[PDB]
From Swiss-Prot:
It comes from the Bacteria. Belongs to the RecA family. The gene is recA. SUPFAM superfamilies: Hedgehog/intein (Hint) domain, Homing endonucleases, P-loop containing nucleoside triphosphate hydrolases, RecA protein, C-terminal domain. InterPro entries: AAA+_ATPase, DNA_recomb/repair_RecA, DNA_recomb/repair_RecA_CS, Hint_dom_C, Hint_dom_N, Hint_dom_sf, Homing_endonucl, INTEIN. It comes from Mycobacterium tuberculosis (strain CDC 1551 / Oshkosh). ATP binds at G63, P64, E65, S66, S67, G68, K69, T70. This is Protein RecA. This protein undergoes a protein self splicing that involves a post-translational excision of the intervening region (intein) followed by peptide ligation. Can catalyze the hydrolysis of ATP in the presence of single-stranded DNA, the ATP-dependent uptake of single-stranded DNA by duplex DNA, and the ATP-dependent hybridization of homologous single-stranded DNAs. It interacts with LexA causing its activation and leading to its autocatalytic cleavage. It is found in: Cytoplasm.
Amino acid sequence: PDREKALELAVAQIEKSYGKGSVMRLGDEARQPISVIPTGSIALDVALGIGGLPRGRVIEIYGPESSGKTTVALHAVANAQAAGGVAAFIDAEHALDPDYAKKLGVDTDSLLVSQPDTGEQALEIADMLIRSGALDIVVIDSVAALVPRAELEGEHVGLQARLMSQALRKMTGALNNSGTTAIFINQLTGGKALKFYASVRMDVRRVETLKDGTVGNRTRVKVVKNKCSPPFKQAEFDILYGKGISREGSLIDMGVDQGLIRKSGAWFTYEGEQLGQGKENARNFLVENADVADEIEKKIKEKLGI
């Protein structure tokens, strides 16, 4: 009886002295913000709790080469722009494919891009850009490529981590004020600081190759760190070569997950209407009928926080 008070009281001190998400029960309902940046998959948006990536915060998306992290990052960029936001892409990797970015939603013409000479220049440019107040999102591709000036100039080893720590310390205050989201893409170094500064960390992986005959990959994302909603939630969704995340595919999956879409036979049905026989026909139905996809989306968001 008097214990529940003491705990609630303790949770409150922790909340006051360290911040809103400093302690959570894993069954807690998410703290719904005004605006977020959707990720392209409703499943991933739900796994994040707040319906997308938070604003004004450091975000890490990591995984193996071609795991899908950059695609997740580019959808964040597409969605941020679709809401009238400006985007930046700090590129020390030189891997970006704008044609891919166009197809999945990015306004590449509008995309600010910078190919910095050094690790510090990359982070400093990001900082100037953030402190402007004008950006909604900045992507850093990538953490590993942020090589320090001294290394590049040929002039001990360990200051790459000290560079990030110094940068993140200064950057984090700028992000909160501006409301800009910073996505750091990272591989499986210098991320030891990023691990603690990031409000969300996402572990992206290829789980299974999709197929017509012999197209894409089923992708799995675990939210290993989340200061905005209970962490350790995971999601799956499809990334189709040349197209990106199958938005419609995630609506079906979360559709059946939520009982809004019934899978009577190979047929997926919705509201008495039939969507298609098998997944691909249902997926295809929802892209041709954007109105019903929005209907299904609205219902899924309604039935949860999002």
